[model samples]
Target: KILVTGARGSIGSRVAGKLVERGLPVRGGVRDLAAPGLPEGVEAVQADLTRPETLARALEGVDKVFLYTVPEGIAGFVDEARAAGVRHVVLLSSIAVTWPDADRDPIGRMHLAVERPIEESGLGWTFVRPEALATNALGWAPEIRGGDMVRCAYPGAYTTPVHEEDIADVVVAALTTPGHRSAAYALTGPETLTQAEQVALIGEALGRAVRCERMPEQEARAVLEGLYPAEVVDAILAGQAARDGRPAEVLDTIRAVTGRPARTFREWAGDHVAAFRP
Candidate 1:
């Protein structure tokens, strides 16, 4: 049986569904089994990663697991996973962990904390470190739906926005298939796109002409600070600043692993245009 933590979340939900579609046994670990909108057919277990005790029942008979990084209780989780006889684990980590100064990068450090224990626990592991996810565009849904103008602080900032399904595909392969053990894959979309280019793609998908407006740095910083910690806000803005006029790096890791090319941002926009349309 496969156990998927954070099963109600965007990535976890898709992972569970894709695995189930292939007729694989899937057990969803959720904070609430009674929660409305839980996936059907798949067994739902009330498991909270934060509370190690709650994981016992969820871990029962689960051979493979899809883990979300929770640095707080990672040691307890490793202990429980070891005790539970989990054979393999596919972790959802960040590409930041591959940064040169991972130890000093706040985001990288956060994911590394959880990764270290899993590495030492002797369990077979695969780490899926994704670059900027295409779903991050969902943040602009409100503005797009309201009208046609998309405002950004860094119009030229570039990223290879990966599709969530691609990430799920890699996880499923690691779980049920062989050959991915102990491997770390840094995943990205097929192409790099600037912020303005992304907005144009969304507009094309929505069958409308959307405009891009650059916001002042100070204004953007204030907005980011409201949603994230000061450290994270600064890191994000700094990263964007560095990418001001450069395109993001694209990788073939997804295609290499899954035997198919990663979906382009255009495809992602086409699939999610409903969210951008009024």
Candidate 2:
């Protein structure tokens, strides 16, 4: 059976559904065992990554695992998994881990820190470092659906946003099949698109024209800070460094690894436009 952390999340829940559709046994790990929404037939386990010791049972009889890289050490996780005979792991890491110095500004180092034990573990592993998640735009769906303008900062900055499904596809392959052992995929979308331009694509997909306007950086930070977790906020701020024509560029690695071209943001927006509409 495959054990998936962040199981009720956008990426994790989808990954669980895909695996289940393929007849794979899946264990959906949640922080709260009583949490409401999740894929049916997937076993629910309460395994908190922050408290790795509690995860011993999470790995039992589990051959593969999908991990959300967190601020905690994986040494305990590795030890428990090793004892439980867990063989493979696909970790959701970040592109920032590549340039640890530049990515190190905040939680970039955190991912780097999270990978150490997984690397040293005697288990097969694949690390995914995708660029921006196209699914992130789900945050702005309400305004677009309401016919209200989408307001944000960094109107000019662009990103090669990878579809979360593509990332999960890579993970599914790594978990269920061989050939991706010890591999790290720098996953990005098919194109580098400006933030405003991406909003336009979402608007186009919804058959509407939503304006993308910028607010002051401080206002953006303040609004986002309370809404986002600390590490996520730090990652978003540090990502501003990528706008200078650096790591946000598209990469062909996703195609090379998955034997298919990476899906563009337009495609993602198209795929998810219904959420915006209703």
Candidate 3:
């Protein structure tokens, strides 16, 4: 059976669903199974990353795991998974892992620090270092679906946002297939578009024209402070220089490795329009 942690998250839920759909026995490690629905044909096991001892039940009978890297005590989790006989781990890491100056970004530093033990564990591992997720636009879905204008802090900045489904496909392929071990895939979208342009694409997907307006950085920080830590916000905002109209090259990792093309953000936005629904 395959184990999936953070089963309630977007990528985790999708990964679990994909595994179950493929007729694989999937055990979802969740903190609350009674909360609501779970992926069909999957067993839900109560597990919280904050509480490591409770994870034994989730790790039982599992040889492969889809892991979400929590900032704290992640090494302990890896040790437990190793002790439980987990042979392969497909971790949802971030693109920041590629930067030599990863410490410049606090979030990236955390990922690099946490990945140390996982690498040293000698367990077969594949890291999906994906760029910004397209689902992040869900924040703008509300006003866009209602035909309200979209606002952004750095509307002119551009990025290649990979669809979450594409990431899930890579995860599944890595965990189930051979030759993907000890690999780190830096996944990006087929094209890079400005934040304003990304909003426009979503509008097109929704069959409407949406206006994007930019607010001052400080103003944006005011709104984002509680949602994101100051260091994280600073790190992300500091990267704006690298993203302005910069072209992001596409990778064949998804196609070459998984035998399928990566899903485009347009397609993702069209199908998940409800996220934008007011």
Candidate 4:
């Protein structure tokens, strides 16, 4: 059976659902079996990434796993996967790990902590490193619902915000296909868009006029600090500052792996317009 952790999360849930649609055996490892969003036909196992003791039960009869980076329990997870005879691991990582200065970046280090040990464990591994997720726009939902303006720092920051389903499509291919072992895929959307342009796309998707307003960097920092570690917040601000007018790299790896072109950010905005609606 394929074991999928974080199956209630945006990407993992889609991966698990897609696997089920393919008629594959899927076991969703979650902290709560009663969580309402689990995909139908996915066997739910109570697995907590912060608690290692829950892993063995989650890993039982599972030869393949979809793992997210959780540094605290990754060591324990590797031990359990080894014991459970797991052969393949598909990791949800970040494009930051591939940065030239990754060694000096806290965000990169966070993902590496989990990635390094998995690589050393001798399991066939594939890393799906998405640059930016279009779901991040969900952060703007409340503001958009309340007003015609979306406020954020770095309105000019460009990102190729990939769709979650695209990420899942690549993960599923790595899990079920051959020749993907020991590979790393850098996933991105089909086109790069500035943060303002992204907001405009959402406006188009919602069939209304919406404006993008820049937030004071300090204010943005304060808001971000509440949601992420200080180091991560700093890195994000720095990265966005650096990407002020630069376009994010777009790759053909998605199409190569999934036999389909990567979906556009507008498509993503269209698909999720309901969340932006009041």
Best by TM-score: 1
Root-mean-square deviation of every model = 1.3, 2.7, 1.9, 1.6
Candidate 2 lDDT, tens digit per residue, 24-86? 999998877777377987898977766776688788899989998866757778888889898
Q: How accurate locally, in lDDT, is each candidate?
A: 0.88, 0.82, 0.81, 0.90
Per-prediction TM-score to the true structure, in the order listed? 0.96, 0.88, 0.92, 0.95
* lDDT (10s digit) by residue, model 3, range 136-190: 8887765676664877677888778888888988898887778888999999876
Model 1 TM-score is 0.96
Model 1 poorest ten-residue lDDT run: 32-41
lDDT for predicted candidate 2 compared with the true structure = 0.82
Model 4 per-residue lDDT at 186: 92
Clashing residue pairs, backbone N/CA/C < 3 A, model 2: none
lDDT of 4 by residue, 219-247 (tens): 99999998999988998899899999998
Give lDDT for model 3. 0.81
lDDT (Cα, 0-100) at 65 in candidate 3 = 88
- What's the candidate order when arranged by decreasing TM-score? 1, 4, 3, 2
- Name the regions of candidate 4 deviating beyond 4 angstroms: 222-232
Error of 2 at 236 (Å): 4.4
